[PDB]
Amino acid sequence: TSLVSAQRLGIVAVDEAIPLELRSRSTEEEVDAVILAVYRQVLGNDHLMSQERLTSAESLLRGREISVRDFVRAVALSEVYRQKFFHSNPQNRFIELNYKHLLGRAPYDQSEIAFHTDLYHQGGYEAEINSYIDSVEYTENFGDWVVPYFRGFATQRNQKTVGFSRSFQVYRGYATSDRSGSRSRLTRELARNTASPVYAGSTAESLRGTSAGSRNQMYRLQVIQGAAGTRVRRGKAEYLVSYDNLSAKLQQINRQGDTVTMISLA
Amino acid sequence: AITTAASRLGVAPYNESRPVELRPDFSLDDAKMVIRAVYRQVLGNDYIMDSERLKGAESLLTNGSISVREFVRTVAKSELYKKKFLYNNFQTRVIELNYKHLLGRAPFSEDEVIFHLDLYENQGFDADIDSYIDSVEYQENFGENIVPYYRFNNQVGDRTVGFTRMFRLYRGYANSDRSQLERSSSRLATELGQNTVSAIVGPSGSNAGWAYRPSRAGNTPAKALGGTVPFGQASKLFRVEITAISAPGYPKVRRSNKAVIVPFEQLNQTLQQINRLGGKVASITPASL
Amino acid sequence: MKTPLTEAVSTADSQGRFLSSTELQIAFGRLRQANAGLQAAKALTDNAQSLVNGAAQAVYNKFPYTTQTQGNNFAADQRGKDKCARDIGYYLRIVTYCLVAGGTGPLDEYLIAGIDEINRTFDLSPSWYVEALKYIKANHGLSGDARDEANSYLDYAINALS
Amino acid sequence: MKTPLTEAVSTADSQGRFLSSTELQIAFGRLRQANAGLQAAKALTDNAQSLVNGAAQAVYNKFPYTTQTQGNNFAADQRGKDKCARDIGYYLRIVTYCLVAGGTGPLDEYLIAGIDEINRTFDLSPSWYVEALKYIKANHGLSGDARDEANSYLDYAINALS
Amino acid sequence: MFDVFTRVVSQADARGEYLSGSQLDALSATVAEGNKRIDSVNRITGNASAIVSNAARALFAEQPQLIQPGGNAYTSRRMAACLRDMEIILRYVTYATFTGDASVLEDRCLNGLRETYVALGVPGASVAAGVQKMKEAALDIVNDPNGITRGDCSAIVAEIAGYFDRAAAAVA
Amino acid sequence: MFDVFTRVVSQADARGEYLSGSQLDALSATVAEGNKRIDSVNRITGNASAIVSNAARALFAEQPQLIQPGGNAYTSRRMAACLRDMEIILRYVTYATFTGDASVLEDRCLNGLRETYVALGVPGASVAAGVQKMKEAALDIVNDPNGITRGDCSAIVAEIAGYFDRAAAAVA
Amino acid sequence: MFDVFTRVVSQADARGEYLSGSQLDALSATVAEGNKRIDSVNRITGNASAIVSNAARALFAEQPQLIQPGGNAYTSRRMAACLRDMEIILRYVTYATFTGDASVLEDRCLNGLRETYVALGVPGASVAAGVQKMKEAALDIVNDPNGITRGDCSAIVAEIAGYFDRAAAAVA
Ligand SMILES: *[C@@H](C)[C@H]1/C(=C/c2[nH]c(/C=C3N=C(/C=C4\NC(=O)C(CC)=C4C)C(C)=C\3CCC(=O)O)c(CCC(=O)O)c2C)NC(=O)[C@@H]1C
Ligand SMILES: *[C@@H](C)[C@H]1/C(=C/c2[nH]c(/C=C3N=C(/C=C4\NC(=O)C(CC)=C4C)C(C)=C\3CCC(=O)O)c(CCC(=O)O)c2C)NC(=O)[C@@H]1C
Ligand SMILES: *[C@H](C)[C@H]1/C(=C/c2[nH]c(/C=C3N=C(/C=C4\NC(=O)C(CC)=C4C)C(C)=C\3CCC(=O)O)c(CCC(=O)O)c2C)NC(=O)[C@@H]1C
Ligand SMILES: *[C@H](C)[C@H]1/C(=C/c2[nH]c(/C=C3N=C(/C=C4\NC(=O)C(CC)=C4C)C(C)=C\3CCC(=O)O)c(CCC(=O)O)c2C)NC(=O)[C@@H]1C
Ligand SMILES: *[C@H](C)[C@H]1/C(=C/c2[nH]c(/C=C3N=C(/C=C4\NC(=O)C(CC)=C4C)C(C)=C\3CCC(=O)O)c(CCC(=O)O)c2C)NC(=O)[C@@H]1C
């Protein structure tokens, strides 16, 4: 996005990122950069140990035996990708990680969760992974030679608006990674076809003045509430409380049976 | 509810005053109404000069940065509130004022005094204010978005002792909680300590005997222990509270307020005698049977 | 946005590398250019109003129809002339920003990106702005490195428009 | 953090007013005390190890059962002695923090709040720490304003423990 | 919140270490500047209404779109809110100067202010311009030589400049 | 919240049906195990302080970075908050044991606890380790065969273990 | 991200105004300072491995709980990830020094870092301590007078120290 929203949302680096294309007759440093970019983006910005590198796959990329898309497929199908994204993750978290790593976006619909779940159940992890890489979306966005990059913060054709908001649920910052078993943040949002407020970068913080407590810290409690007291006017509720009253807010939320969806520092 | 005696007490203006709620996506008049209601009720109807107004808390409430409950908390923890109600008051009076402002009711028993005085002494005034505001009672009555209001009417977890003590704490609509006859003295220390009640005396303009207050000592007890025996033959006994006794003058008149237990058969004579002594009848309560 | 220092850092970061002698030479080139760029920005700022007014008049002279045909996209009335002068001032101010920054990054971020569909939606002819930029090129009165860098920005805008 | 300056600003902010002469006098008193507090912190810091060892020895002498009775809460072994020396060092270091800050705020924030729950849960006698603080009072060797302010913080800790 | 003393104390406590000799010497140095700091706080406070009013007048003179009908400073309620905002920023800047630390300004005033302004359509660039006007008005008032003891206040002026820049950067 | 009976009542009411003979017999079997359930609750309650203190000691021995300066359990208010959190987890586990249902533990203790610990910077994995220590001590205490009518308490012990695992899984 | 020039460019564009004479002179002053800024970047880069290794050694000596089994720097993978974090922080500090602006730190290096550390259980205070060690070593390397033209580099050293402190505060 433009700078004025970019600094607020903490997505400046994504906006200024330039797609990396492996051209013909590329030098050694260009193949090195492509391999590094693929490892960074497909493995979700983990510190990749040299013992986890795909030496044969990157040799085939180096000798121009395979394309960038093929190397991306090899990294995605590799046991390293399985270990850190599949074997200890729920299926819905796993496929949103696949959407982030392979297509550079957040899931748009619950039907996309129904797809890749049935696809896994029929054809295994390999068929499920190949669905993303062989998709029309991957072809039109990246082709055979462009390293996949995150696209959820930019307006795409055939995109739902919610994706942009949901993008902030799968991209938590430039210095973040998809390393830690974890549950998807988008489960209820996808199932009920909703959107959640974006609290990313500096958007989550709120004014304090003298209303914050001793340590000048406010907390935002996003809860789902119903009538169990006073009249409830909305199903969604947001409470801004100081640290000193946080426990009290939690307990009164708890004794009314309201479910806490998110708690963040504001 | 209170219907026939609402105007005599100060309850009638609060009968048609609905609770002030800040709805989601509120307008600016809604924000100003919440600010006005909070100033009137939390600060006990004191006049608020412009220099004492909490501009930042008002701004934050207007913006939605804080809720009504948070704004009430900020007002109750402010230096304005502590100057008006904390620094010059016995902590039992502070507790009475806290219950009246933040909960809209009088303290029920000595246990509340115990809890709040211990909490003030061990963790400070701010923590005590928090206990008033984070209480289950506050949540069920006002919640997050409703300005606290006087709870005159009977409710689920009430005691009638609170109904009687409300009129010890509240002295009329044009009254300001720092402009009452008892001034800075605790109104309920004896009552909460002894688990007793006082006959309800209404506010000034609606009740001629409004100014009656019992003294420190030498007060006529509520009930007629002994029955009608000291009064010869009598049917029923009544405790009459009399204020503004002045006509005979000192030394014939020592205390301008006097409570007398009189038989039914002397009630006519008692009333005439009260008229002669220039007094005003505050209340008359059955004392026997 | 596109400047020698930020792109050197972004290229180095995408490669996971420290800044090496290459990026240091990039900074040296920026330092060599920067004083001339700053004095070009000062000279354009001081004579900004005269340059903007003269550029608008040159556009009106070479495109006289813009001064008497009625319509929202033309400068026949005062509102059109105010919009036109504001647009030319936008161009000149962003060019001074480029001279300060040492790259076309201000032009790309503020003006160049999305200029074509704006010009299309509001039926604004890019040849008008090309003539305004040509007047600015011919009347800024700069010399040496300041002129060379400023003209590079002005005809970068011209190339983007044509 | 209860310090003169932070509390002055907090009180002024609750009234929403600028800092008047009252807060300036609070700052002047803080300035009058600060050099003595800093020298007190330096003297306590330079002598800290001997103070902690001597305080630990004083506690072990007054309560010999702590050095000879088995149990996690006692110092009959090396682990318990190390925990005891660590606790006394915490006390001394936070006292130096109080001397630097000009108030009991470090003691309140780091040590005092919740200490009775600590001593109850882990069966630690507050009398031990009172004896350690008395040794520090009797042995810090401070004089004048530094001694008065340091003894105020040590006595604050003693009063909290008693 | 922190002041100049408790900031170093908190860093040391997180490290579990006593303050070093250099840190204590630096704290003694800022004690030696304390009179100058109190003078700065007093001079800005004593000129606060003039600073806010002149800065606002200059801001609306150079940005007439703020006060044109429909502008963000148009209507007396929004103009009052703008003036109040300027005074709030100036007051928290004085708080930061008094404490010797930007924690009060950042935590109580600046945090979430940009979000609030965005959500309201308050133009943060012009608020930053107004804070910049209050900037030189206050720096010239702090540096006014008349009726004060002679000495160099360059360090405290730089610190106040930094607080004013933090506030302008936070809003913009 | 739900207890063991009201859980099946809610499920039956959502289906519009009476409990079946199998459901009534399962509830009767729960009733027949009630004395052991009360015994287990009583034994954990009577040793709650010991469980919390021993588990905290074991956790801080195995994870010393929690109590070193700068650690999340360092300073008396944070160590006390941590001990209080241990106590709260144990108390709600006892509540779940008493009711025969995990709804009280989920709805009143674990609701938003992971998000709370993430927001506060409290390490949830270390909390889970402390919960595992409380689990092992408490299961030993419930299985102690001294001074109680001998019986097989494996089912209630497995249920208590499940509640402890639920707490530890929610925090970690 | 911004460099020292584009920061004021973006501020001016939001204001819709040309850079004033004072801003252009300040930028010219920054340009005249440029050679020593390039030396500071070069000196930190040429000693990056020594800075990272020595600071890591000092951090693990001061906090042995990190490297003992069960600690967050125990095992080769976790230790190597820690060494990479140190190198990365130092590299981004060099980026900030080279550009003259801190936006590269917030945009990239500190963008969600505290969230990452909380999620993984990495002790942020220990990272801040390591960053402080790298700060002291790098400032010593920059201030070394041997083999360079003599001059005053106090302003650039203060700026580098500010970048290091901001990195430390992002995780502390
Ligand atoms: C596993 C939990 C252990 C175990 C338990 C066990 N308890 C009983 C029997 C009883 N225990 C009680 C309990 C109480 N009586 C009281 O008044 C109170 C105080 C409020 C308590 C806690 C009772 C009433 C009984 C029944 C009578 C009796 O004393 O036996 C049994 C026997 C089976 C039964 O369900 O009645 C068992 C098995 N036994 C073990 O071996 C475990 C270590
Ligand atoms: C503080 C940083 C230290 C310091 C620096 C300093 N350097 C110079 C001068 C120059 N330094 C360079 C740098 C390079 N030349 C190269 O080819 C390379 C590799 C690409 C580098 C890094 C240059 C070009 C100069 C100018 C020539 C000269 O040697 O004078 C100065 C002098 C002032 C100036 O701005 O030129 C200073 C102050 N000096 C100290 O005392 C600190 C320890
Ligand atoms: C114009 C009337 C107002 C305005 C608009 C504005 N929007 C954006 C950015 C985005 N708009 C969308 C919306 C969609 N993308 C889609 O694909 C769809 C259909 C499914 C919609 C509805 C999104 C997602 C973005 C962000 C991503 C992107 O910009 O590509 C901007 C740019 C904001 C920035 O800072 O760059 C603007 C300016 N702004 C106004 O002031 C008008 C009132
Ligand atoms: C070392 C001083 C301390 C320490 C570090 C540690 N960090 C991680 C893991 C990660 N570190 C990062 C950080 C970055 N990645 C980037 O791309 C950027 C640049 C913008 C940064 C700042 C990330 C994202 C991770 C996530 C995991 C990954 O593998 O990348 C670990 C690993 C934790 C684990 O393996 O579970 C460690 C150990 N740990 C200490 O104890 C030191 C105090
Ligand atoms: C060593 C005994 C001889 C030698 C080797 C050499 N090989 C290459 C380059 C490549 N080797 C391969 C082969 C494979 N890669 C794989 O992944 C697998 C398993 C499927 C095999 C068999 C490939 C594909 C290449 C090209 C890619 C790459 O360079 O890594 C080189 C480099 C050639 C060059 O750089 O141009 C060399 C040096 N060289 C000798 O002199 C020995 C006789």
Ligand SMILES: *[C@H](C)[C@H]1/C(=C/c2[nH]c(/C=C3N=C(/C=C4\NC(=O)C(CC)=C4C)C(C)=C\3CCC(=O)O)c(CCC(=O)O)c2C)NC(=O)[C@@H]1C
């Ligand atoms: C003015 C003609 C005389 C005078 C007045 C005076 N009054 C007060 C204080 C209060 N006045 C009221 C009255 C009302 N408040 C209401 O809300 C209503 C309508 C329902 C009325 C009629 C109240 C309650 C107060 C107390 C509140 C407060 O803030 O004071 C004072 C102030 C006394 C003091 O500050 O100590 C004064 C001075 N004084 C004169 O000399 C005139 C004859």
Ligand SMILES: *[C@H](C)[C@H]1/C(=C/c2[nH]c(/C=C3N=C(/C=C4\NC(=O)C(CC)=C4C)C(C)=C\3CCC(=O)O)c(CCC(=O)O)c2C)NC(=O)[C@@H]1C
């Ligand atoms: C101790 C030397 C003697 C003693 C004391 C005692 N006091 C109470 C109860 C109360 N004390 C107070 C006091 C105050 N209220 C305030 O507002 C202030 C401070 C501003 C003070 C000093 C109050 C209000 C109570 C009631 C609440 C409470 O009970 O805590 C008791 C308990 C009385 C009872 O029966 O509950 C006692 C024991 N008693 C002696 O015998 C000593 C000579």
Ligand SMILES: *[C@H](C)[C@H]1/C(=C/c2[nH]c(/C=C3N=C(/C=C4\NC(=O)C(CC)=C4C)C(C)=C\3CCC(=O)O)c(CCC(=O)O)c2C)NC(=O)[C@@H]1C
């Ligand atoms: C009915 C047999 C007689 C009667 C009753 C009557 N009562 C009221 C009003 C109130 N009743 C109470 C009593 C209580 N409040 C409590 O909290 C408790 C329990 C702890 C008691 C016993 C109170 C305080 C009120 C006033 C407040 C309220 O009603 O909410 C009325 C209404 C009077 C009026 O409307 O003014 C009536 C009619 N009246 C008869 O004639 C019967 C003999």
Ligand SMILES: *[C@H](C)[C@H]1/C(=C/c2[nH]c(/C=C3N=C(/C=C4\NC(=O)C(CC)=C4C)C(C)=C\3CCC(=O)O)c(CCC(=O)O)c2C)NC(=O)[C@@H]1C
């Ligand atoms: C004079 C400084 C102020 C003043 C006085 C005032 N007092 C009265 C009336 C009475 N005063 C008393 C006195 C007492 N009762 C006792 O038992 C004691 C102790 C032994 C005392 C001191 C009484 C009983 C009355 C009423 C009967 C009587 O008048 O004697 C008045 C007259 C009030 C009226 O209007 O009736 C006055 C004026 N008034 C001021 O303005 C001075 C500040």
Ligand SMILES: *[C@H](C)[C@H]1/C(=C/c2[nH]c(/C=C3N=C(/C=C4\NC(=O)C(CC)=C4C)C(C)=C\3CCC(=O)O)c(CCC(=O)O)c2C)NC(=O)[C@@H]1C
């Ligand atoms: C002047 C050379 C000719 C001319 C001008 C004219 N322009 C417009 C309208 C717009 N101009 C722009 C351009 C920009 N906005 C920016 O933010 C920037 C980048 C920093 C640029 C270059 C835009 C977006 C518009 C439309 C919105 C607006 O009105 O501001 C008009 C009016 C068109 C209309 O329909 O309102 C005119 C008249 N007209 C001539 O005849 C000249 C030859």
Ligand SMILES: *[C@H](C)[C@H]1/C(=C/c2[nH]c(/C=C3N=C(/C=C4\NC(=O)C(CC)=C4C)C(C)=C\3CCC(=O)O)c(CCC(=O)O)c2C)NC(=O)[C@@H]1C
């Ligand atoms: C020394 C006077 C006596 C003694 C000490 C002893 N202490 C413990 C355990 C703890 N001490 C503390 C205290 C603090 N932690 C802090 O962070 C601070 C504030 C900065 C303080 C004051 C705590 C929290 C513990 C328990 C957790 C921990 O181990 O850190 C022990 C061990 C108790 C146990 O059960 O493990 C001991 C032995 N013992 C003696 O005999 C001395 C007389």
Ligand SMILES: *[C@H](C)[C@H]1/C(=C/c2[nH]c(/C=C3N=C(/C=C4\NC(=O)C(CC)=C4C)C(C)=C\3CCC(=O)O)c(CCC(=O)O)c2C)NC(=O)[C@@H]1C
């Ligand atoms: C003045 C230079 C510019 C301007 C200002 C303006 N601000 C608002 C509204 C608010 N300002 C705040 C800010 C604060 N409130 C506080 O308590 C504090 C300290 C923590 C701050 C910094 C808030 C919260 C609001 C909203 C609530 C309120 O209205 O008070 C407005 C009004 C916006 C509206 O539409 O109502 C205005 C006008 N506007 C300009 O154009 C100037 C550049």
Ligand SMILES: *[C@H](C)[C@H]1/C(=C/c2[nH]c(/C=C3N=C(/C=C4\NC(=O)C(CC)=C4C)C(C)=C\3CCC(=O)O)c(CCC(=O)O)c2C)NC(=O)[C@@H]1C
């Ligand atoms: C101890 C095993 C670990 C640990 C704990 C720790 N927790 C906090 C703070 C809070 N914990 C809670 C949780 C609850 N409060 C409740 O009322 C209930 C029931 C709903 C729960 C589960 C809350 C809300 C807080 C914050 C508010 C408050 O403390 O009252 C802290 C303090 C953190 C801080 O002071 O910043 C700590 C230390 N820390 C560890 O390192 C252990 C692994």
